[PDB]
Structures are given as structure tokens and as C-alpha cells.
Amino acid sequence: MENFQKVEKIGEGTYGVVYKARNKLTGEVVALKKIVPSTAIREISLLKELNHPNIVKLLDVIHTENKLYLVFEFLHQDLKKFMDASALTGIPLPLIKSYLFQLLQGLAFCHSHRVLHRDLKPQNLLINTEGAIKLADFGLAREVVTLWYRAPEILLGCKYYSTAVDIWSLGCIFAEMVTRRALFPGDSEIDQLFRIFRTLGTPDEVVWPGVTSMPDYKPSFPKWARQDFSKVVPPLDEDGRSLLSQMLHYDPNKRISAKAALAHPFFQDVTKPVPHLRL
Numbered sequence: 001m002e003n004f005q006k007v008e009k010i011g012e013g014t015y016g017v018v019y020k021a022r023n024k025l026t027g028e029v030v031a032l033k034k035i036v037p038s039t040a041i042r043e044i045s046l047l048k049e050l051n052h053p054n055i056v057k058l059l060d061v062i063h064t065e066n067k068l069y070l071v072f073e074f075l076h077q078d079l080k081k082f083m084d085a086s087a088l089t090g091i092p093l094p095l096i097k098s099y100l101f102q103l104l105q106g107l108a109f110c111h112s113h114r115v116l117h118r119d120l121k122p123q124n125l126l127i128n129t130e131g132a133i134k135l136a137d138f139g140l141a142r143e144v145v146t147l148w149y150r151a152p153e154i155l156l157g158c159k160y161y162s163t164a165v166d167i168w169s170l171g172c173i174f175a176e177m178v179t180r181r182a183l184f185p186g187d188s189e190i191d192q193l194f195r196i197f198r199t200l201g202t203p204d205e206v207v208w209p210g211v212t213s214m215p216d217y218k219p220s221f222p223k224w225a226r227q228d229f230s231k232v233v234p235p236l237d238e239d240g241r242s243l244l245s246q247m248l249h250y251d252p253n254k255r256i257s258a259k260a261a262l263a264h265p266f267f268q269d270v271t272k273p274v275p276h277l278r279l
């Protein structure tokens, strides 16, 4: 740690404070996360090899005094702040599309290595001036923690959920970029589930075989009808609405994979615009 100079506290991650810091030697500017069971150590050390342009680079892992510091590449802004900043006019579709495409590439990569994020949210999607967007805190899962982006199988008590949970989260984030409002802003586990049900309809054995057998499923759940996506994410075009609908399929087995999503017609005209960032 004596190797780093703390510049400022950039936020409170799930495990500790995240700082912007400077390597007292190389002058390198980095993000320093202060998080030790040996299981964690080997899992985190594994992340050092999970390198991709759309995954925030983990530079080094430092274990000292029974303390754990993660040294990451630094990015100046996150999607939450950017969305807040683009509130009045909304993020341009071409930029939304580029961000979604890059994030799907990042997930396709992690998923191909059987690594799940598990907790995607605007706060951990980091952006730069070059128009890039990156997944942060990847694999760290394996203040109130937000449930807004939680997949229904997690809420229903599925213990062995899949890569599909990240697809669900990204779909929620995609909708939020488009409409400028959170899709399912639940403030409790039941409120989150019920918000999902009210929009996508209460799931049953027809749309999701095996759902009624999930640990936290209750036959007493109210039965709401499904809403049209045309009402949910106007004025997203049919290609975007088709893609969104697949990313939000109830049955995780039917939910589109990151790889298949990258082939969707929505991305036929994808480009990489530069966002206007004010640092």
C-alpha cells in the first residue's frame, strides 16, 4: 500500500471504498479497491487472467496485514452518472447501441470462461472518452445493495443460476438507457419481483416450466397480465424491442445468450460514437 497515493474516494463499492490513486513510483493512475480466506485469494487471482477490452483491467492483487487491495485500471466515469448527465436529452440511440454491443462482447467473453458477473448495474459500467464501456467488479461476487437489476430466478431462490442472470441485468440497463427511467426499481425482494410480474406478467408453467417449484415461489402470488413492449420502452424500434424481449425472457434457458445477442439484427448498423464527457 505504501506504493500508492490516495487521490480521492471515488465511491463505496460493495466490499469497500474505491479510491483513485497514484503509483508513487511509475506515476500510474489507478483505481484502488480496499476489500482473507484463501478461497477468495485464488478466485481473485484467477480474475487477473480474464482480460478483455470491455472488462476493467485488474492490474494487481495485494494481500498485506491480512488486508486485500485490488489495483485496477482507472476510468473517469460510470454509466449511472452519464445517464444522469444525459437526462434532459437522453443518450443517443447510436451510443446506446454501441454500449450494449460492447457490453455483450464483454459478457460473451466472461461467459465463455464460465465466469459470471452476478451484479451488473449502471454504477459498475465504466466509460472513457474513446467511446468504450467496460464491466467493473467482474467475478468479485463468486448502503443498500440495489435489487433493480436482479434476475427473477435469483429472486425466486434458484441457488445455481446461470450466465443468463447477466443477460437479464443488461436488458434492464438497456431499457433504462432508452427510457431514462429504471425499468424495475424495487425496494425489497417482493417489491422487485412484483414489479417484474406487473410488467412481464406473473410467470407460470406455460412460459417458464419448473417455475412453480422454485424455492421462493408462492401460489399466492397475484396474477398480473403481461404488458406490450411497445408500452414499456417506447420509442425503441422493433429490432431493439425484439432483442430486449429476448434478454428478458423468464425462463433462463430460453433467455438469449450474449453470443446470440451479438448476432441480432439490432446490431446490423452498429457504430462507435464518441460520448461527450465532461471530466
Ligand SMILES: CCc1cnn2c(NCc3cnc(N)nc3)cc(-c3c(F)cccc3F)nc12
Pocket: 009, 010, 011, 012, 013, 014, 018, 031, 032, 033, 056, 072, 073, 074, 075, 076, 077, 078, 123, 124, 125, 126, 136, 137
Ligand atoms: C475498481 C475498478 C474501477 C476503475 N474505475 N472505477 C470507477 N470509475 C468511475 C468513476 C470515477 N470517478 C468517480 N468519482 N466516480 C466514478 C468506479 C468504480 C466503482 C465504484 F467506485 C463504486 C461502485 C462500483 C464501481 F465499479 N470502480 C472503478
